[PDB]
């Protein structure tokens, strides 16, 4: 907030401030947001398929026929595709201590701390998908099961629940990203006044 250093150092620190945010805030969140988005976008593709996976067989209530295997197969391909996909860092490693930090800063439910090797990373939490598969596994024989209305709805409730858990974390990401912009903005705002005070402060010193 003053060091009575050249305007050269001030304009330099300012420029540096933009680089910091861009890499630690924007990029950091543009990845987590993109990563999660891509995944949920793959899950939404499953939902579209889910519609053609349900049919009647009452007779009738209407008892619902569900292609358990078909849904299980799709669901286990999604978790696979994003099983180890990381949210942070985008393309590097970190200390399990700093990895646990980031996770506790954007919630904790959204991602899961893990180690690849060379360090640690905060990967996507595949719990929602797991609970989904556990629910389907509990359904019964494969790869086609028929459940009365009460049973179907009860299941759909659980299923739908999981969906929203991801739908939520998805929106949250957008938050943690906008927050990064805030902190970065707060930075440049005071950094600027700093440079100027140095300038006016500097001028008095120059003036002295």
From Swiss-Prot:
Effect of residue 123 to N: In plasmid pINV_F6_M1382
Subcellular location: Secreted
Superkingdom, taxonomy of origin: Bacteria
Gene Ontology BP term (one): effector-mediated activation of host programmed cell death by symbiont
Effect caused by changing residue 16 to K: In plasmid pINV_F6_M1382
Region of interest: IpaB binding: 68-143
Signal peptide as annotated in the record: none
Covalent S-S links between cysteines: none
Result of changing residue 115 to E: In plasmid pINV_F6_M1382
Outcome, altering residue 69 to K: In plasmid pINV_F6_M1382
Induction of synthesis: Synthesis of this immunogen is repressed at 30 degrees Celsius and restored at 37 degrees Celsius.
Effect of substituting residue 27 to E: 50% reduction in hemolytic activity
Keyword line: Coiled coil, Plasmid, Secreted, Virulence
GO CC annotation, single: extracellular region
Major localisation: secreted
Additional information: Deletion of amino acids 1-20 abolishes invasion activity, affects contact-mediated hemolysis activity and IpaD secretion. Deletion of amino acids 41-80 and 81-120 restores invasion activity to a higher level than wild-type and reduces contact-mediated hemolysis activity. Deletion beyond amino acid 120 reduces invasion activity and abolishes contact-mediated hemolysis activity.
UniProt record similarity statement: Belongs to the invasin protein D family.
Function of the molecule: Required for bacterial invasion of host cells. Controls IpaB and IpaC secretion, and the efficiency with which they are physically inserted into target cell membranes. These proteins are exported via T3SS to form a pore in the host membrane that allows the translocation of the other effectors into the host cytoplasm. Along with IpaB, is essential for both blocking secretion through the Mxi/Spa translocon in the absence of a secretion-inducing signal, and for controlling the level of secretion in the presence of this signal.
Entry text on domains: The N-terminal domain is an intra-molecular chaperone that prevents premature oligomerization of the residues on the coiled-coil region that are involved in interactions with the needle and/or itself. The residues in the C-terminal domain probably form oligomeric structures at the tip of the needle that are responsible for the regulation of secretion of other effectors.
Name of the featured protein: Invasin IpaD
Species the sequence originates in: Shigella flexneri
Species classification: Bacteria, Pseudomonadati, Pseudomonadota, Gammaproteobacteria, Enterobacterales
Whole-protein coverage range: 125 to 332 of 332
């Amino acid at each position: 907030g003053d060091q009575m250093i050249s305007h050269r150092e001030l304009w330099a620190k300012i420029a540096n401030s933009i680089n910091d945010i861009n890499e630690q805030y924007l990029k950091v969140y543009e990845h987590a947001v993109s990563s999660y988005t891509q995944m949920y976008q793959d899950f939404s593709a499953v939902l579209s398929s889910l519609a053609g996976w349900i049919s009647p067989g009452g007779n009738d209530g209407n008892s619902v026929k569900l292609q358990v295997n078909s849904l299980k197969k799709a669901l286990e391909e999604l978790k696979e595709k994003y099983k180890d996909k990381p949210l942070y860092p985008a393309n590097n490693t970190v200390s399990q201590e700093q990895a646990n930090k980031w996770l506790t800063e954007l919630g904790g439910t959204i991602g899961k701390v893990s180690q690849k090797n060379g360090g640690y990373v905060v990967s996507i939490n595949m719990t929602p998908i797991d609970n989904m598969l556990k629910s389907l596994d509990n359904l019964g024989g494969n790869g086609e099961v028929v459940l009365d209305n009460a049973k179907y709805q009860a299941w759909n409730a659980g299923f739908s629940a999981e969906d929203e858990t991801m739908k939520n974390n998805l929106q949250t990401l957008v938050q943690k990203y906008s927050n990064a912009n805030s902190i970065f903005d707060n930075l440049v705002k005071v950094l600027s006044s700093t440079i100027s005070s140095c300038t006016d402060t500097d001028k008095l010193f120059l003036h002295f």
